[PDB]
UniProtKB/Swiss-Prot annotation, chain A:
Name of the protein this chain belongs to: Glutamate receptor ionotropic, NMDA 2B
Entry remark concerning the domains of this protein: The extracellular N-terminal domain (NTD) endows NMDARs with a unique capacity for allosteric modulation, harboring several binding sites for small molecule ligands that act as subunit-specific allosteric modulators of ion channel activity. A hydrophobic region that gives rise to the prediction of a transmembrane span does not cross the membrane, but is part of a discontinuously helical region that dips into the membrane and is probably part of the pore and of the selectivity filter.
Post-translational modification comment from the UniProt entry: Phosphorylated on tyrosine residues.
Disease: Intellectual developmental disorder, autosomal dominant 6, with or without seizures: A disorder characterized by significantly below average general intellectual functioning associated with impairments in adaptive behavior and manifested during the developmental period. MRD6 additional features may include seizures, hypotonia, abnormal movements, such as dystonia, and autistic features.
Span covered, complete protein: 34 to 139 of 1484
Function of the molecule: Component of N-methyl-D-aspartate (NMDA) receptors (NMDARs) that function as heterotetrameric, ligand-gated cation channels with high calcium permeability and voltage-dependent block by Mg(2+). Participates in synaptic plasticity for learning and memory formation by contributing to the long-term depression (LTD) of hippocampus membrane currents. Channel activation requires binding of the neurotransmitter L-glutamate to the GluN2 subunit, glycine or D-serine binding to the GluN1 subunit, plus membrane depolarization to eliminate channel inhibition by Mg(2+).
Subunit structure: Heterotetramer. Forms heterotetrameric channels composed of two GluN1/zeta subunits (GRIN1), and two identical GluN2/epsilon subunits (GRIN2A, GRIN2B, GRIN2C or GRIN2D) or GluN3 subunits (GRIN3A or GRIN3B) (in vitro). Can also form heterotetrameric channels that contain at least two GluN1 subunits and at least two different GluN2 subunits (or a combination of one GluN2 and one GluN3 subunits) (in vitro). In vivo, the subunit composition may depend on the expression levels of the different subunits. Found in a complex with GRIN1 and GRIN3B. Found in a complex with GRIN1, GRIN3A and PPP2CB.
Top-level taxonomic group: Eukaryota
Record organism: Homo sapiens
Localization annotation: Cell membrane; Postsynaptic cell membrane; Cell projection, Dendrite; Late endosome
Glycosylated residues (UniProt): 41
Binding locations of Zn(2+): 94
Family: Belongs to the glutamate-gated ion channel (TC 1.A.10.1) family. NR2B/GRIN2B subfamily.
Tissue-specific expression: Primarily found in the fronto-parieto-temporal cortex and hippocampus pyramidal cells, lower expression in the basal ganglia.
Swiss-Prot record, chain B:
Functional description taken from the UniProt entry: Component of N-methyl-D-aspartate (NMDA) receptors (NMDARs) that function as heterotetrameric, ligand-gated cation channels with high calcium permeability and voltage-dependent block by Mg(2+). NMDARs participate in synaptic plasticity for learning and memory formation by contributing to the long-term potentiation (LTP). Channel activation requires binding of the neurotransmitter L-glutamate to the GluN2 subunit, glycine or D-serine binding to the GluN1 subunit, plus membrane depolarization to eliminate channel inhibition by Mg(2+).
Protein name in UniProt: Glutamate receptor ionotropic, NMDA 1
Gene expressing this chain: GRIN1
Span within the parent record: 72 to 120 of 938
Origin superkingdom: Eukaryota
Annotated disease: Neurodevelopmental disorder with or without hyperkinetic movements and seizures, autosomal dominant: An autosomal dominant neurodevelopmental disorder characterized by severe intellectual disability and developmental delay, absent speech, muscular hypotonia, dyskinesia, and hyperkinetic movements. Cortical blindness, cerebral atrophy, and seizures are present in some patients. Neurodevelopmental disorder with or without hyperkinetic movements and seizures, autosomal recessive: An autosomal recessive neurodevelopmental disorder characterized by severe intellectual disability and psychomotor developmental delay, involuntary and stereotypic movements, spasticity, and inability to walk without support. Intractable seizures manifest in some patients.
Post-translational modification: NMDA is probably regulated by C-terminal phosphorylation of an isoform of GRIN1 by PKC. Its phosphorylated state is influenced by the formation of the NMDAR-PPP2CB complex and the NMDAR channel activity.
Location(s), subcellular: Cell membrane; Postsynaptic cell membrane; Postsynaptic density membrane; Synaptic cell membrane
Entry similarity comment: Belongs to the glutamate-gated ion channel (TC 1.A.10.1) family. NR1/GRIN1 subfamily.
Amino acid sequence: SIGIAVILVGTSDEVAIKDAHEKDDFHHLSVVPRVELVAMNETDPKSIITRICDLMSDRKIQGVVFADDTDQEAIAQILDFISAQTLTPILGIHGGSSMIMADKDE
Amino acid sequence: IQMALSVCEDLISSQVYAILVSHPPTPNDHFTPTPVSYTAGFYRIPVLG
């Protein structure tokens, strides 16, 4: 079991999102996804760097999924830098994290 | 990794309008300015190498 954490910034309902958190009918293989709902106002880089690199210390996780509902023009680039410095895959889903970029580090 | 933590929690808060990139102790290294120009480039702060 590898913990998967989801982070979202903005106005949203925690219970509505958490209703479908434990809804993946993955009985074929024992994935056991320990989905954790994380909500924090982390637009600034300081909040992101002090939270992303602290998650592994508390909870043993090898995968992070990021979502957002803001129109930031450079959040995707600054969030991509953590992926380059680590080996934990991260996926941009919603908001500025899904904006286009030219190239990625190898 | 500590560069982003150290640069933006100790330098940008001190009202700096220009930042100079350091020099790697080993010339074959590369990641001396790559953390400096990322965090400092968020706020359109000129950086000199």
